[PDB]
């Protein structure tokens, strides 16, 4: 009776993060609402008619937090730990990831060009920092690496011209180069391997990453969770402190942990005394994102020799519509029926880059044949396609300024908008980040913590590993 009623909207990792922290604390006065039947949001998994396990782009787990690792161990027994083997298909070669560090694997002419332009851009200095991502990577890597990889690959994944993107999200995503190391790589044909936070990752033996959140759902108190299409939140009244759902039910909260898209939130949230309130519709309109198409191809037999131990593959060239392919069957044999393997292809989509959905599956197959993934004789089963409206929250120029206009106003009225699209911060938009934003929001609501470091300070969380444990393990 004395504790605040905490309501969580969304059973993705962020929402489930909040629910797990509350459960760990033995907190009783909360409830979680989800409009889908399945927990896990963008990290959910599917099982098809033919025994193929699929998900939304071949998710792998790589945690920045001891807490989240403990939760993984608690929720799921039976993990595979893999060494990342990732490649770029470009100029007819398999270039080890990251592209920019491994230009010695390009054909001679392209390698020379890449090296020469890197030397050239090193020779050019500038009074002001780059104003955008394209200016940044062009100055940093030179015109060779920009033209061959950065420019075409980035438009291909983001579906937004990179000159419209900010430059501060890149810390753990875009690897730097060192001219001396590259020259030596070229003399020795020495691959530069191991860079990045996912150089090692873990993957559940059965059920994909989505089994994590299905297991978590099972471990939480059933009467505190609602999974039902009628419980899609469609209006928030911040004065009354109520949520109205599509089925017409109205419920109260003292605190709201919202994980719905930030633009959706702004559009459906009413109240008085919000500073800047009448700007909210224009703010919502300015939030840039790409949609994501996932295509699953089930294949009879076993992968060809070059893909035997591959994880994921990058495709900058226009001979394929997908920016990435994942050999999902290499993450776990239980992902496919006996005697098969599988590819998962991702194709980005936006107003800048429209997609013809009626030909999408066939176009991907043509892409696979032209990109060394499939052969004409391959026998395909379980062709599958799924489209996600909000796939990547683009780190567009001005993003922070926009978030700063409204987020503090929402928080002052006990509304915490968190998660991949809840907070719209790509650089802390993976599963561990999201889950932890949920955990940290709960700590902040309950006064157990002064700050929410993940959502507020991406530099700090991605530079250190958080040490603190999860009690239930
Ligand atoms: C192609 C792709 C590949 C990815 N790969 C990786 C990876 O390899 N590793 C990794 O760690 N992360 C990966 N991610 C990121 C991962 O998907 C997210 O970090 C995570 O799913 C975000 O969780 P979230 O709960 O903040 O949002 P979501 O996961 O989208 O969860 C939000 C939930 O809210 C619900 N909801 C929305 N609106 C309402 C409403 N109005 N009413 C009621 N419920 C609502 C939704 O149904 C959903 O279930 C990938 C993402 C994509 C798109
Ligand atoms: O060889 C590479 C591959 C990717 N990237 C950059 O790293 C970013 C993140 O890509 P990744 O596959 O790591 O993240 P994801 O798309 O899965 O979120 C991309 O946008 C690229 O700009 C890069 O610099 N070199």
Composition of the chain by helix, strand, coil, percent to 5: 40, 20, 40
Ligand nearest to the CA of 157: 2
**Bridge partner list, 175:** none
Q: Which technique was the structure solved with, according to the deposited record?
A: X-ray
| CA atoms of 376 and 379, how far apart (whole Å) | 8
Tokens standing for 90?
């470009």
Of 259, 282, 275, 293, the closest CA to residue 435 belongs to 259
Contacts of 361 (CB under 8 A, 6+ apart): 295, 383, 385
Distance 13 CA to ligand 1 centre (A): 7
> Which residues form ligand 2's pocket by a CB distance below 6 Å?
88, 97-100, 154, 157, 173-175, 314
Tokens standing for 167?
């430059």
Give the CA radius of gyration of the chain: 23
Tell me the CB-side half-sphere exposure of residue 210, using CA atoms within 13 A: 20
Distance 132 CA to ligand 1 centre (A): 27
Residue 437 is labelled as binding a ligand: no
Residue of 45, 247, 259 with the most ligand 1 atoms within 8 Å of its CB, for mutation: 259
Three-state SS at 295: strand
Distance 36 CA to ligand 1 centre (A): 12
Eight-state DSSP code of residue 150: I
Q: Which atom of ligand 1 is nearest to the CA of 60?
A: 8
| CATH code, domain carrying 295 | 3.50.50.60
42 lines ligand 1 (CB under 6 A): yes
Residue 384 is labelled as binding a ligand: no
Is residue 368 within a helix (H) or strand (E), and if so which, with residue range? helix 360-370
For the chain, how many helices (H) and strands (E)?
A: 14, 20
Distance 415 CA to ligand 1 centre (A): 19
b/e code 117-129 from CB counts within 10 Å (16+ = b): bbeebeeeeeeee
Report yes or no: 47 and 211 within 8 Å, Cβ to Cβ: no
Of 95, 20, 29, 453, the closest CA to residue 251 belongs to 29
Report yes or no: 276 and 406 within 8 Å, Cβ to Cβ: yes
Tokens standing for 365?
């197959």
Distance 311 CA to ligand 2 centre (A): 14
34: domain range? 1-473
Report yes or no: 20 and 14 within 8 Å, Cβ to Cβ: no
Q: Write down the residue that tokens 């730097």 correspond to.
A: 176
Ligand nearest to the CA of 441: 1
Ligand nearest to the CA of 88: 2
Three-state SS at 77: coil
Residue 309 is labelled as binding a ligand: no
Ligand nearest to the CA of 195: 2
Question: Residue 358 burial by CB count (10 A; 0-12/13-18/19+): exposed, middle or buried?
Answer: exposed
Tell me the CB-side half-sphere exposure of residue 20, using CA atoms within 13 A: 33
Distance 98 CA to ligand 2 centre (A): 8
Q: How many domains does the structure of the chain reveal?
A: 1
Report yes or no: 241 and 410 within 8 Å, Cβ to Cβ: no
Tokens standing for 255?
């605190």
Of 177, 134, 440, 426, the closest CA to residue 290 belongs to 426
Left if phi > 0, otherwise alpha if psi is -120 to 50, otherwise beta: which for 209? alpha
232 lines ligand 1 (CB under 6 A): yes
9 lines ligand 1 (CB under 6 A): yes
């Amino acid at each position: 009776l004395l504790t605040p009623k905490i309501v969580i909207i969304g059973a993705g990792p962020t929402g489930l993060g909040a629910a797990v922290r509350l459960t760990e604390l033995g907190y009783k006065n909360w409830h979680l609402y989800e409009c889908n039947d399945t927990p896990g949001g963008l990290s959910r998994s599917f099982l098809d008619e033919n025994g193929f396990t699929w998900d939304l782009g071949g998710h792998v787990i790589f945690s920045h937090y001891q807490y989240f690792d403990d939760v993984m161990d608690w929720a799921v027994q039976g993990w595979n730990v893999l060494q990342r083997e990732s490649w770029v298909w470009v100029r007819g070669r398999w270039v080890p990831y990251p592209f920019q560090n491994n230009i010695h694997r390009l054909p001679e002419q392209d390698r020379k060009r890449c090296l020469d332009e890197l030397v050239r851009s090193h020779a050019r200095t500038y009074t002001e920092p780059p104003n955008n991502f394209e200016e940044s990577f062009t100055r940093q890597f030179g015109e060779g690496i920009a033209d061959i990889f950065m420019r075409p690959y980035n438009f291909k994944v983001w579906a937004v011209p990179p000159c419209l993107m900010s430059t501060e999200w890149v810390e753990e995503r875009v690897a730097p180069v060192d001219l001396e190391r590259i020259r030596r790589n070229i003399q020795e044909n020495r691959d530069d391997l191991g860079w990045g936070p996912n150089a090692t990752f873990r993957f559940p033996q059965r059920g994909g990453t989505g089994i994590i959140y299905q297991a978590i759902k099972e471990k939480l108190p059933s009467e505190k969770l609602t999974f039902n299409s009628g419980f899609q939140a469609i209006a928030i009244d911040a004065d009354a402190k109520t949520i109205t759902f599509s089925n017409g039910e109205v419920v109260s909260y003292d605190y709201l942990i919202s994980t719905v898209p930030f633009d959706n939130l702004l559009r459906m949230t009413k109240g008085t005394g919000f500073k800047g309130y009448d700007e909210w519709p224009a703010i919502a309109d300015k939030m840039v994102y790409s949609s994501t198409n996932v295509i699953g191809i089930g294949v009879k037999g076993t992968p060809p020799p070059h893909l035997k131990t591959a994880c994921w593959l990058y495709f900058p060239e226009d001979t394929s519509p997908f920016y990435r392919a994942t050999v999902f069957s290499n993450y776990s044999k239980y992902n496919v029926p006996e005697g098969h393997w599988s590819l998962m292809l991702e194709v980005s989509e936006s107003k800048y880059k429209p997609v013809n959905h009626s030909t999408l599956i066939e176009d991907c197959i043509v892409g696979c044949l032209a990109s060394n993934l499939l052969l004409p004789e391959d026998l395909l089963v379980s062709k599958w396609h799924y489209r996600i409206e909000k796939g990547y929250p683009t780190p567009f120029i001005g993003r922070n300024n926009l978030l700063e206009k409204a987020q503090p106003e929402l928080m002052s009225r006990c509304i915490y908008s968190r998660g991949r699209f809840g907070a719209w911060r790509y650089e802390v938009g993976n599963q561990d980040h999201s889950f932890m934003q949920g955990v940290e929001a709960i700590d902040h609501v309950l006064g157990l913590a002064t700050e929410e470091t993940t959502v507020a300070n991406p530099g700090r969380v991605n530079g250190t590993r958080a040490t603190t444990h999860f009690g239930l393990l």
